[PDB]
Amino acid sequence: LPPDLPDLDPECRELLLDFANSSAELTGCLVRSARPVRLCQTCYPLFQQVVSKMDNISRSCARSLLMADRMQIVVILSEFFNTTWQEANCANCLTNNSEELSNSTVYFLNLFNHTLTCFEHNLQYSEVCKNCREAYKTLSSLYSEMQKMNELENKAEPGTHLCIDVEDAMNITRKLWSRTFNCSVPCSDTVPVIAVSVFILFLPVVFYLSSFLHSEQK
Amino acid sequence: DLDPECRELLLDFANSSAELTGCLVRSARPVRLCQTCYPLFQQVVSKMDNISRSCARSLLMADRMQIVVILSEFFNTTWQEANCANCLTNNSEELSNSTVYFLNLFNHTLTCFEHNLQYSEVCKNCREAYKTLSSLYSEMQKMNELENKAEPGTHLCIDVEDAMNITRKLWSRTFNCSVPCSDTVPVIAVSVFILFLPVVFYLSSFLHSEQK
Amino acid sequence: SLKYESLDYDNSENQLFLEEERRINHTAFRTVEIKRWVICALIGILTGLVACFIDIVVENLAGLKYRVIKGNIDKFTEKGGLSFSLLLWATLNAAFVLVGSVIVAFIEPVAAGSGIPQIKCFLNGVKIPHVVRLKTLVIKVSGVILSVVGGLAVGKEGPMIHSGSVIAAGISQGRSTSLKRDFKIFEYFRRDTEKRDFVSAGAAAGVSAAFGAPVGGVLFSLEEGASFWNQFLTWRIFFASMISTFTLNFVLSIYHGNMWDLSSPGLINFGRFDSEKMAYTIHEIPVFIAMGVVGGVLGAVFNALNYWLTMFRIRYIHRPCLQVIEAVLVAAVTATVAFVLIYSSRDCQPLQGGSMSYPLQLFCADGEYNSMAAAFFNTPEKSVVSLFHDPPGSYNPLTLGLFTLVYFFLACWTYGLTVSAGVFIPSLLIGAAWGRLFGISLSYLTGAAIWADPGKYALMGAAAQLGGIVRMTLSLTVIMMEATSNVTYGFPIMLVLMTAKIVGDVFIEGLYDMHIQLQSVPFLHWEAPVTSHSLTAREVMSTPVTCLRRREKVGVIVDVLSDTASNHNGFPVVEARLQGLILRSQLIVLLKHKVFVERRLRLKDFRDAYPRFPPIQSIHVSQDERECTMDLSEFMNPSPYTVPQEASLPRVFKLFRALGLRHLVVVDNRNQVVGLVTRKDLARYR
Amino acid sequence: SLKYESLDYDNSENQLFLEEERRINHTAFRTVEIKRWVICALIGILTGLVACFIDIVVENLAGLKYRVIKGNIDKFTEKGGLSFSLLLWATLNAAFVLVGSVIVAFIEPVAAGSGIPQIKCFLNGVKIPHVVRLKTLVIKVSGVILSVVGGLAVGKEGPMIHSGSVIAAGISQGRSTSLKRDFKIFEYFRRDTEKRDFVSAGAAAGVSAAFGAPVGGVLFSLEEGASFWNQFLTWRIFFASMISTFTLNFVLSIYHGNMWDLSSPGLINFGRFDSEKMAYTIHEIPVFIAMGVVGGVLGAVFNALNYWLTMFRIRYIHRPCLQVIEAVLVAAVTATVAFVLIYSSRDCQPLQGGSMSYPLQLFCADGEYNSMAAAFFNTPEKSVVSLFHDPPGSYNPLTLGLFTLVYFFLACWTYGLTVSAGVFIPSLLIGAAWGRLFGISLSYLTGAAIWADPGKYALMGAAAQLGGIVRMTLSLTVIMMEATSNVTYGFPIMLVLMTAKIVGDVFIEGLYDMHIQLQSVPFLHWEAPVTSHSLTAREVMSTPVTCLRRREKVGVIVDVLSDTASNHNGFPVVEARLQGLILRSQLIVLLKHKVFVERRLRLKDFRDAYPRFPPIQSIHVSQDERECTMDLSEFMNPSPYTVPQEASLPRVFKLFRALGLRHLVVVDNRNQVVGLVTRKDLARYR
Ligand SMILES: CCCCCCCC(=O)OC[C@H](COP(=O)(O)O[C@H]1[C@H](O)[C@@H](OP(=O)(O)O)[C@H](O)[C@@H](O)[C@H]1OP(=O)(O)O)OC(=O)CCCCCCC
Ligand SMILES: CCCCCCCC(=O)OC[C@H](COP(=O)(O)O[C@H]1[C@H](O)[C@@H](OP(=O)(O)O)[C@H](O)[C@@H](O)[C@H]1OP(=O)(O)O)OC(=O)CCCCCCC
Ligand SMILES: CC(C)CCC[C@@H](C)[C@H]1CC[C@H]2[C@@H]3CC=C4C[C@@H](OC(=O)CCC(=O)O)CC[C@]4(C)[C@H]3CC[C@]12C
Numbered sequence A: 001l002p003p004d005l006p007d008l009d010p011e012c013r014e015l016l017l018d019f020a021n022s023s024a025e026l027t028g029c030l031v032r033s034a035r036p037v038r039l040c041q042t043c044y045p046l047f048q049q050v051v052s053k054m055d056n057i058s059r060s061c062a063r064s065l066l067m068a069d070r071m072q073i074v075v076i077l078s079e080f081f082n083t084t085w086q087e088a089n090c091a092n093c094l095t096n097n098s099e100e101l102s103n104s105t106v107y108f109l110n111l112f113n114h115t116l117t118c119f120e121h122n123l124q125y126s127e128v129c130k131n132c133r134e135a136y137k138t139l140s141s142l143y144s145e146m147q148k149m150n151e152l153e154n155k156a157e158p159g160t161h162l163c164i165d166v167e168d169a170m171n172i173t174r175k176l177w178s179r180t181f182n183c184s185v186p187c188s189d190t191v192p193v194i195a196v197s198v199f200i201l202f203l204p205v206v207f208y209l210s211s212f213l214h215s216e217q218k
Numbered sequence B: 001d002l003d004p005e006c007r008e009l010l011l012d013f014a015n016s017s018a019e020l021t022g023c024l025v026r027s028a029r030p031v032r033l034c035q036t037c038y039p040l041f042q043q044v045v046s047k048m049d050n051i052s053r054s055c056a057r058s059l060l061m062a063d064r065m066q067i068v069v070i071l072s073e074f075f076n077t078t079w080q081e082a083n084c085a086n087c088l089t090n091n092s093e094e095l096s097n098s099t100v101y102f103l104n105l106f107n108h109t110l111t112c113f114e115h116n117l118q119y120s121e122v123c124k125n126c127r128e129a130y131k132t133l134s135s136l137y138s139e140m141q142k143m144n145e146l147e148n149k150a151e152p153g154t155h156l157c158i159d160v161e162d163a164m165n166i167t168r169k170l171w172s173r174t175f176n177c178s179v180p181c182s183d184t185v186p187v188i189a190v191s192v193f194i195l196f197l198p199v200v201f202y203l204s205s206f207l208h209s210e211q212k
Numbered sequence C, D: 001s002l003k004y005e006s007l008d009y010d011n012s013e014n015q016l017f018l019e020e021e022r023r024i025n026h027t028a029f030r031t032v033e034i035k036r037w038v039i040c041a042l043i044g045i046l047t048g049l050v051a052c053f054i055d056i057v058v059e060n061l062a063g064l065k066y067r068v069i070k071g072n073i074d075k076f077t078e079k080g081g082l083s084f085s086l087l088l089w090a091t092l093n094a095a096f097v098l099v100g101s102v103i104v105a106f107i108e109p110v111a112a113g114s115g116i117p118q119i120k121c122f123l124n125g126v127k128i129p130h131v132v133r134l135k136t137l138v139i140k141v142s143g144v145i146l147s148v149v150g151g152l153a154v155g156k157e158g159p160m161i162h163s164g165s166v167i168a169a170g171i172s173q174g175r176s177t178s179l180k181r182d183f184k185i186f187e188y189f190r191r192d193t194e195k196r197d198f199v200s201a202g203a204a205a206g207v208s209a210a211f212g213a214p215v216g217g218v219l220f221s222l223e224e225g226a227s228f229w230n231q232f233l234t235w236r237i238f239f240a241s242m243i244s245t246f247t248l249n250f251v252l253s254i255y256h257g258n259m260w261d262l263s264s265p266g267l268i269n270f271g272r273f274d275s276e277k278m279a280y281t282i283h284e285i286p287v288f289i290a291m292g293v294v295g296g297v298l299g300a301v302f303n304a305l306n307y308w309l310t311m312f313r314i315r316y317i318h319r320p321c322l323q324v325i326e327a328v329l330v331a332a333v334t335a336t337v338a339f340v341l342i343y344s345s346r347d348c349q350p351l352q353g354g355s356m357s358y359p360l361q362l363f364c365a366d367g368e369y370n371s372m373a374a375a376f377f378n379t380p381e382k383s384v385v386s387l388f389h390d391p392p393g394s395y396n397p398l399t400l401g402l403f404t405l406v407y408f409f410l411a412c413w414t415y416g417l418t419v420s421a422g423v424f425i426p427s428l429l430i431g432a433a434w435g436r437l438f439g440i441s442l443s444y445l446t447g448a449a450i451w452a453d454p455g456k457y458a459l460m461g462a463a464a465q466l467g468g469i470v471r472m473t474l475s476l477t478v479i480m481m482e483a484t485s486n487v488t489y490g491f492p493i494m495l496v497l498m499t500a501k502i503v504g505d506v507f508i509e510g511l512y513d514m515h516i517q518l519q520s521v522p523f524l525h526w527e528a529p530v531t532s533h534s535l536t537a538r539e540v541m542s543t544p545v546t547c548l549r550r551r552e553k554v555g556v557i558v559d560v561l562s563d564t565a566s567n568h569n570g571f572p573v574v575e576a577r578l579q580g581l582i583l584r585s586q587l588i589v590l591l592k593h594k595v596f597v598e599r600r601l602r603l604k605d606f607r608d609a610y611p612r613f614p615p616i617q618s619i620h621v622s623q624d625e626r627e628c629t630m631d632l633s634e635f636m637n638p639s640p641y642t643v644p645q646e647a648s649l650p651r652v653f654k655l656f657r658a659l660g661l662r663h664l665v666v667v668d669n670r671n672q673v674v675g676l677v678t679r680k681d682l683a684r685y686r
């Protein structure tokens, strides 16, 4: 028999084995970076390796390895990695060179670390909410600014997610800041809001009653 | 970060999914998925179920990009699409006898092709080996309908389906061994006679009303 | 032509009717309107169940037939003797059609065809004999099953309209004349006014069951009735259409097991067009218009060949024995041509998930199945759906082109056979076939552009060919819209249907109108012809008029009714100053009960003889009774609709058609009867 | 009541009309019907473009307003001073409504409300002054934009029906009376018969643009016209509806960038119900019926409170200055109640992608928006869509319950304001709200069973509440069917709409019929009331009748027309033997041109004064001319529709309504005029 159907063609055996460990290393790195998420800052070497190896395996082995059967493992695995990469939306957090993290991304993690270490020495949560607020506000302001840059430089769609690692890092701070540290900002607007609202809601009562009483006698 | 006693089920799931992904690629062009790494798939499933059994809340739905959940979903989707459940028995611990029966007939048929390779000899030496492999493939295609109450007969174990296709492409596209009997002359005569009937019926009806 | 009698749709508001309505309103709650809704619900349920019965039986019987044929072909493919498989296929086709043709040709010829022209005539107000008899329904349902299982190039969706009408016309009466069983219910509705309203609900229920288009069913009945807007009737008609398509969906879901999946609203289910592939641009609009031109031209050719064939069959194949033989021969030829195309087909493809119900491997590689075999072994509904929803490159143009050319002539040849069978689906299949071929050509000419999706053009071709053949525009467009479940597709579908009718009307009339004309039925169109607006009621009316005095001698009434030179059924009552209108059926009842000036008759007594009134010859009157006088004051229609002598024909035609009139009295300025207008007076203008 | 004049829908087939039709056919090609299709196409295009203009302007203006309000709230959330944000929201709401109310209250009061009752009256055949004027359209379009941007609990879909009608009634005439610009085209269509037909196409085009329901638009116009079936008119009406929804879809797609995505057939787009969650069983049918009972009861309460409020406003708030103040106060209160609910709402959740454009964080954790703010900041169309399509745990019952209770009273309070605004969407939003709450309760009572999907019950609640308020059944059901793009949902939607109308009709009439009655409009229903068969034409006709001789003295004609005790517009022509009918407008034209027995008038001369005929006071006749005689033979309607004295009321009512008559002459046995029937004679029976 020809060495294509029953057994591997030698020129395609090492290319498939190249995809085997490269996809194995990407899968291993994806899981280890899952919680807390560091996906597209730690798995970005292992992901471009998979894409390049698939590119190198597909344009005499592309015909026999991609569409050679019903269950195209190589194609669907590349589809899964591409879907995971795009759903994480870290193409917007990497430069056009894509060789490393962008300056905006690197700026976010280090002051996220600055905020996290600022939280650390203020425990020993009254102290944490007192002085470690400006660090939190600039972290929150940068997140909105980075979101705005995604809405102009990328101009994709309102509400578009950033890279998951940046979004996760912001979430951990928010859960720490608002659910455990219980840093809350009191508001004294209740009385002025009640007075203004009550006055406005009393206007239709006066208008309808005065219109009724005016027509009661000419 | 999670506790060190909690970031070990995650680490166990990492290399287990890495090794499952490793086999899935090197067993892809010649499909041996359900026979090479049916343990490595069950290793991922069992180690994932261990998390479900104090790490489930902090590792499965603790963020937007549930990597552990979607990776388990991908393996389950790949397992179900490959129909590897049919490729084993009910307990899902080893290959079923029918799959092993088909696999060795697959080996026997391919062994027959090598023996008669050195395409005239191949077609007329182990032809009955091809028919019994083809007949068996139709047999398991039929009991698959009744065993799991499937509506059509669409896809068996992908390794079995790939193996049958390998034989069919060899038996039909590489070598021209098939020969169905074409009764062209009897078909033409019967078809021409039938197609000539409406001409007679309409003409005779026309020629009968004429002259009354 | 003169043997067709019009319905008595315009209720005669005589004295007896007024007393009955007064009596009903004083009998506590009035349940007449409620009973109308109950009957309409029953009409929808039974019409849906009939569609369920046809779908289930055809699926099981055609499945058994094709399994036998496939097994025989498989056995003889390699061992030899495939000519026996051809003979078995032809014999099986002949055997089923033999039974189907015999019951139509020998027992009830009115069950031949789809029955849509018969129902169109019934809602037009003219009665074709035996349309709504129980025997007609049984043969129509049995015949269409045998026709479809018999392998004829036909569809089962069309006959559903006739089947629903018969159920409506029988259930609403609460009795069975054929079975001589009278259930003492629904006696109030035993009149032509109620029956035609219920039949419209039944016909609408048939459309909804056939295509899953409840709104399309309503507009079909509204188009055919062409009456004054009746809000409560239209609401009831929609009530029956909604229940009919729901009953078919619910029962089929139970039969298929998944009770939670209501995915079968109709006998044919077009599928989902909610995809990016199923989207069109404004630049495709001129292309769609061109497709409607093709549909109109091909539809005209289809109708022209069928007209020539129908004339030949009327002249030479009118005997029932020859009709049965012709249908049997068509069934054998249909299998033979299919077998020859399958035998010589050199194109096969690997089996998809559900592309072929009975995948036939014949002379090509293992794992591949003959593509042309799928075109003939699959039900035409499945072929239409696949043509609508298939990825580009799914069809080889040669095998699809050969099937389209053959199926076009087979469907044209098969229509008009003495079998119960529809033409909707075959016309849809033909159009979806060459529509897909048009999409394939466009993809070849535009480098497989995304807008040139063959599946989308299959939908336009199916609409264009169906519009080119039956010339349905408003009901058809809504039916297509509901079937595709895509409102935006209405705009191209409307455009292709408009040009298909316009181009088709240039050459020949529609298939349904063609066969109504060939039967010499006095069919009234929506309006008078444009070349007859200069005419008035004086030119179209019939004069002199046979009238009866308000107090008329019995001998005069008998002599008028017993006259054999004419068979008038309406007589103006004069004092020749018009006083009212009396029907022949009313006079027979009065003579039978001997209501003479010398207990009192009620409106129920006139409904007791409905609808089979005895002839005047059955009435025995003595010479002494011939000198008696009969007072028609309490029984005549006291306010018949009248038009002046100088009233224009369009005004006369519009009033006659909208009110469903049978007799329209023409009077001068002194209210003297000068003429009478019936449907034959208006239908003679073309 | 006596100031409303009926349309002259029934064309007078006088001698002049016959010659004009004869001359038109004398030409090589008759282009009258082609021009009808061109006008209908233009009606659909312009109606779609108006819907595009409203949608684009509202989206941009409301986006600017909510960005300003959100930015102000965000600034004052932490630093304090949120009472200024409430004042800014109320002031912005007041400012837009101030302009919207002023242009309605002071410039064109007929533009108030949705305009559907006015269009319903116009298709009923009765003319409300200034309905189809250019100024009315400008105020209606501008008013609805300011009303929606003004934050009122209103919708913009309803006014589209009125806007389409005005375009239809003006474009078809080929001229602008308001702008004093006469384009020398479409002069043939300057008559009431053509105008009402085009307005029906315009009203249908408005429905299709508003809801993406072209078939629902056709049935709306068919319901309101309630005329004899006109196949070619209905085909043209569907032509306009199809183009209107396509033009809106095509232009919006260009505005949104994705030209190849036609995902916006209407102003409101319900979405897709083609999912397993959106499936129902037969066990839910009694549950759906119970929802219609709730919709009927709540709709009756909504209509009862609005009737009491409308009576109060008519009595005390009838001055234009007070009307403007009332609308401004409602706008400020609407913002204030929304702010209070938002301020005190403790329910907030994370941003789950899209679902809004202005997520408001107020007093809870970062990364979370206030949930109640989304209910008010989102457009009501988008809130309805979210309620239809949301996971079963998307809504807090308390947050949704408080919004439903408040929005119910806000919508009821706002409907009768002197602003251009619709009630369709607010009724849909109310029903979708408590319908979703019903689904949440069912999920709680059945352990989150898969059949108890809250989104499905939101659709049923929206239909039940809308049916309970406006009492639309057949057009509404098809509109819901087309909007959901699912025929199988027609069966539950039909059932809930039936019981919603039945339960609602027990307590009070529908909102549109309620306001028509309060305006004392002579509105004709579909049929005469239950006390109809006991009445005859004699008891309902007006007698004695002011008639004119065929050759009548000019002085007699002037005195009849100049009489101030009555303002009759139709006069039977006698010789009192009926010969025809002549209109007051025709007589004025004859007097103006001084056509006396002692150059010849054409039908164009009568259309030249249409539709603003000069009064009789403008006619100056001398004593010498008063003795001259006028021959009415060539100008009268030679065949007016007549009924006998003893003709029953249902027969009289059916003929009058179906033909769109204005005058129905009652004659005795000798064709002597004994009475006259107009719409006021028939509408007085309840
Ligand atoms: C799976 C579902 C299967 C569907 C089951 C029903 C099938 C069916 O409907 O069959 C038609 C049958 C009448 O069929 P018949 O042939 O018996 O009666 C003809 C007559 O023949 C004509 O007379 P014609 O105008 O040609 O001279 C006349 O025009 C016609 O209106 C009929 O007259 P009615 O006797 O009804 O008054 O309905 C009945 O059985 C009703 C019985 C019980 C009704 C009470 C229920 C509440
Ligand atoms: C294209 C070929 C044709 C050339 C265009 C004709 C010009 C035109 O259409 O003019 C405006 C039109 C008449 O509006 P007008 O107010 O000028 O005229 C009233 C009169 O006022 C009433 O009289 P009424 O019964 O209350 O006493 C009478 O009942 C009515 O029929 C009118 O009478 P016509 O003058 O049309 O004969 O309406 C509109 O908005 C159209 C919107 C324009 C498009 C909207 C942008 C998207
Ligand atoms: C033609 C292929 C592509 C499609 C398969 C359909 C045929 C098997 C059918 C369709 C039309 C049929 C024909 C329609 C009309 C006639 C005329 C009929 O009468 C005459 O030819 C004599 C008429 C005379 O003498 O006036 C003989 C049968 C025939 C050819 C029929 C034979 C069977 C035909 C060819």
Ligand SMILES: CC(C)CCC[C@@H](C)[C@H]1CC[C@H]2[C@@H]3CC=C4C[C@@H](OC(=O)CCC(=O)O)CC[C@]4(C)[C@H]3CC[C@]12C
Binding pocket: D297, D300, D301, D304, D307, D507, D508, D509
């Ligand atoms: C299923 C039903 C029986 C539940 C009863 C609930 C009652 C507590 C409510 C719900 C609906 C209410 C009705 C809704 C509408 C009306 C019409 C309303 O009539 C008018 O004021 C206008 C009359 C007119 O148009 O001339 C009088 C109150 C009434 C009967 C309401 C009275 C109180 C009702 C019956």
Ligand SMILES: Nc1ncnc2c1ncn2[C@@H]1O[C@H](COP(=O)(O)OP(=O)(O)OP(=O)(O)O)[C@@H](O)[C@H]1O
Binding pocket: C002, C004, C005, C006, C007, C541, C542, C543, C544, C545, C546, C547, C566, C567, C568, C569, C570, C571, C572, C662, C663, C676, C677, C678, C679, C680, C681
């Ligand atoms: N009473 C009558 N006197 C004179 N002519 C009549 C009378 N009734 C019908 N005609 C005319 O006789 C011709 C034949 O019609 P026919 O006798 O079949 O009418 P019919 O039975 O009353 O009605 P239909 O056939 O439409 O149900 C027509 O031209 C019709 O107008």
Ligand SMILES: Nc1ncnc2c1ncn2[C@@H]1O[C@H](COP(=O)(O)OP(=O)(O)OP(=O)(O)O)[C@@H](O)[C@H]1O
Binding pocket: D002, D004, D005, D006, D007, D541, D542, D543, D544, D545, D546, D547, D566, D567, D568, D569, D570, D571, D572, D662, D663, D676, D677, D678, D679, D680, D681
């Ligand atoms: N020519 C007439 N002679 C006598 N009574 C009439 C005449 N025309 C109308 N009436 C009656 O006078 C009453 C008032 O109607 P009105 O004068 O407004 O009628 P109109 O202007 O002809 O028609 P409409 O108001 O319906 O457009 C009604 O009862 C009507 O039937």
Ligand SMILES: [Cl-]
Binding pocket: C112, C113, C114, C115, C116, C117, C118
């Ligand atoms: Cl038929």
Ligand SMILES: [Cl-]
Binding pocket: C154, C155, C156, C157, C158, C159, C421, C422, C423, C424, C425, C426
């Ligand atoms: Cl059919």
Ligand SMILES: [Cl-]
Binding pocket: C114, C116, C158, C159, C421, C422, C423, C424, C425
């Ligand atoms: Cl048909």
Ligand SMILES: [Cl-]
Binding pocket: D112, D113, D114, D115, D116, D117, D118
């Ligand atoms: Cl209004």
Ligand SMILES: [Cl-]
Binding pocket: D154, D155, D156, D157, D158, D159, D421, D422, D423, D424, D425, D426
């Ligand atoms: Cl609205």
Ligand SMILES: [Cl-]
Binding pocket: D114, D116, D158, D159, D421, D422, D423, D424, D425
């Ligand atoms: Cl509204």
Ligand SMILES: [Mg+2]
Binding pocket: C002, C004, C005, C006, C567, C568, C569
């Ligand atoms: Mg007759």
Ligand SMILES: [Mg+2]
Binding pocket: D002, D004, D005, D006, D567, D568, D569
């Ligand atoms: Mg008036």
